[PDB]
């Protein structure tokens, strides 16, 4: 019944930059707040307890500050290792509520996405359905809006959208959009198109073709 | 509406107060027949402790001046012959002082203007000599009774206001006053015993409870609230020393609310400061009476003050059971250590009659004094007939339903295991009243006559049925709520009218002709400074009328009365007659007055007669001839030769007997 | 009765 | 129902510094994001910079990394862009672009006139 | 050293019962409280339930109060968690963390210091069977002469774990693999696309290898340009 709200859901900063993540509590938990760091696919670990005490083992760069019912975790010098998700927890009531969870990213140059079409293959006419793919790579950040239109028709609820994690080579992202149609919907309007909008360009990239 | 509701509430409170005053006056006039009684016969109507209180009022109103009357009652040498005592703080005689101070100028100013406040007429009783009966506000008895009943009338108003406060509606106040009126006999006895101390003090106690509930409900603070609370606590403390114990049970209630985060800090400070100031004022006005200290009320004040003032240092605690337990341990430890550390540690008197009565009910502690207390039935366990009467009017079922509803709502609305030290949990006044009701119920069940506290709080808690939040809020609509609330009132009237009809169709008896003859003989055949001893109920009326000095009196709470009583009551023991004559000579008594029914075997309740009481207190003289047998034989055979040192001087119709100590 | 009773 | 304007201009000198300014009129910019765009002959419609709401991180094109500095003033709704070490290849028109979507999808619809910067 | 181990996760059908365990090495039970924390895919950490075995206190979250049950013994130093009537959104990874006992809460619970590795449990209404691999070839009208990409799409496989092997590991440049995506039917689909260099896509018929351990499907799929 207590809400642990974090305003900076997504934070992007360079290596060595000072970073601060805030935490607001609806009630007046005095010093029952803790900070956790979780690597992708791993278990969370304790960083700061009682909002002012540093856990034995974590580097002393991490700091925790308290003001009223507001709390903050700060890192003076950002490094490669402290790239994970951060969670805020309260421990003054039986229902233990965690924070929303903030993600830290690597600030870098923007990349112009490489955008590609992939129509259904020759085996799609016998499997019962057809699938078409619109895929882009090398974009930053994840803020990409892929639109599917057929003779200027909107779609909602059927697209399959996937986005991966940060690249290990150039630290960039890849996104894919999948559109699936049935037999009856396969032989309708010939023109098939998708549009991709990214912050790296001033205008969307449009691909139109004939099935 | 916001102003019409409040004015109507105040007007209805005043109206019910007036109605209660008229009802108690009618009951008193029906029971005692004061309209056609002579002044000395009204004194006789004032029996064992009522006569002892009224005698000092009569002394002050008959003194040459008010200051000399006060000086005469504060240097009294006739109540306990042998030494000089201050009866103003010993007996809590402040109501008598105030009433006399108001009565003397009133008659003085009426006489100057020739206002006829008093009218007298001759009443012809019968074979006895005709006497004069005077009726009017100028008569001292009627002035005293009017003061008592005017004070007692405000109890209905206080109950109405408490019912309104704990329900936020006039329906709650109506429920409370209806429950009070239909159970009037089981709630108070001021109609039959006006001059008792509780008749003066209980209205102020209930007014203090009402003001405290108002302060808690609206979270008030400041010096005005302290003045309001003190103006009720001080009059209640100056009257009826037992008030202290009552204010103990209030404190234990407040603590239990404060420990549950339902009372803010500033209002808790205001309450504790008002209690400290009232205690200091009462202790100073009672002439530094040591028995006020080492009671349960002062150590509780200190303990609650320390608990309140260390509260902010524990604001970081989140586990509510640990917080409540720690506070309770500190409170109990401080109060117990301070009580034991001053009574047993330093010997600062104390009145432990309550503790001794409670010990005799659970253990095998017998004692002579506790046996006097617990064989009279107003200090024994409550009777089942009273519980049947309270359930018959549907007062107890309503209170139980309201308490269950409140407990359910409190459980569903409050986080039991985790506390937040900055949120006030609401409904603190209701919880305080519920805990006070629980304390009063335990007190009344253990000792009957403490019902005075239990029944009005049952009426108050019954008003929780009219609280909208407790009983569904807006799920029960508004038309349904009003429809059900008038149904409860209609059912209450169906089972309350017979009770009030019965209470109004009881007429008492007022003959008592033997004591009049005894007092006439005392006035004619004894000198003014003759010293009398005997049973305490007889001694208080012997002091009140015939104005003779006495050795013992029925006021039994203080110290140095138990030894005098135990020496005087040895005339009913099995001691040798020469020894009891020597005891009487040492105390300096001239006459001993008793009744032949005081020396009668019972065999239904042994060891509640003096014959069986003395065998526990004096085992070694068992097997001797009881002194009561000698008194009966002398009263019958009419020749007092076997009781050589003593001599029967008064013996009429074998009821009252007066012996002369030669 | 040593003391007053409730009547 | 939205519009914006810019200031500055003139013939710049190679290797110099300039402080361009852009400001919207009639609408706030705190809720929306903002971008800086370039339009040049031969290769126009090029992204330069973007800022989301207040300065929790401002992204720039790979060719303008560190040379351009962007400051904002929401009270005056004015945004300054300061550049130094002007290269001769900086002959283009600057656009202060506002996006009306809170999703931060960059659906810019208003371009305005911009400010021309010609070298030599 | 002090550590928490949990076991019992895996695959289950919704509405059934599951019965897992959490054991501890080092510290003895009844000296501290232990909590269960769930993490759903793409979601944050949510507290589930807690138990102090010192004197027998159990507590549950409101959203799951009425189904979960924890029983902790002192002889073997472990706790046992039982679920019944599973829903379709209860799938998650569970961690068994340790904190101070409730009876010594006293200014509140201590922060979770020693966490568990966590067991992943899924609820599904679909049966286990191998995937179907489909080619994914670039169009001739899109980026003809320069950039090009090709790959393979696996569809209709269960459960999640399937890996894609590219030409026996001969190429690692421009490889992009997405997280597995589940449509509402309870069955899995995935794609694997690599950006082939220029010069007519390397004039090589690229191959894909699928790996699905529950069915041991290791078929080889061809890719050809359009």
From TrEMBL, chain A:
Keyword annotations: Adaptive immunity, Cell membrane, Disulfide bond, Immunity, Immunoglobulin, Immunoglobulin domain, Membrane, Secreted, Signal
CDD domains to which the protein is assigned, alphabetical: IgC1_L (cd07699), IgV_L_kappa (cd04980)
UniProt keyword Membrane present: yes
Domain spans labelled Ig-like: 2-89, 113-210
Any single GO BP term: adaptive immune response
Stored SUPFAM superfamilies: Immunoglobulin
Protein name: Ig-like domain-containing protein
Gene Ontology cellular-component terms listed: extracellular region; immunoglobulin complex; plasma membrane
Disulphides: 23-88, 134-194
Cell location: Cell membrane; Secreted
Coiled coil, from the record: none
